[PDB]
Amino acid sequence: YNPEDDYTPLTCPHTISVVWYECTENTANCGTACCDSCFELTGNTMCLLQAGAAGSGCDME
């Protein structure tokens, strides 16, 4: 399962190139709200899983 299967370009300010890193690692906007505005379903899940790996610097809710 690739999260890019439920990526949401329609609203998302990030491209499919620079979505994964961006919502999981770029602390200047990564976190739960990031995933919820670039991914849905199991993609959302996978994004959250990376963003909140075991610390990170993102903002999960």
DSSP code string of 1-44: --GGGSB-TTT-SS-TTSSHHHHHT-TTT-BHHHHTTTB-HHHH
Q: What b/e string do you get for 6-38 counting C-beta neighbours within 10 Å, with b at 16 or more? A: bbbeeebebeeeebbebbbebeeebbbebbebb
- Residue 46's nearest CA partner among 24, 61, 25 is 24
Report the number of distinct structural domains present in the chain: 1
Q: Whole-angstrom Cα distance, residue 3 to residue 19?
A: 10
Which residue type is seen at 17?
S
What residues contact 54, with CB distance under 8 A and at least 6 apart? none
**Domain boundaries, position 41:** 1-61
Which residue type is seen at 15?
T
Residue 49, domain CATH:
1.20.50.40
- Residue 53's nearest CA partner among 28, 21, 10, 16 is 21
Q: Do 24 and 51 form a contact (C-beta atoms < 8 A)?
A: yes
- Residue 7's nearest CA partner among 34, 28, 27 is 34
- Method used to obtain the model: NMR
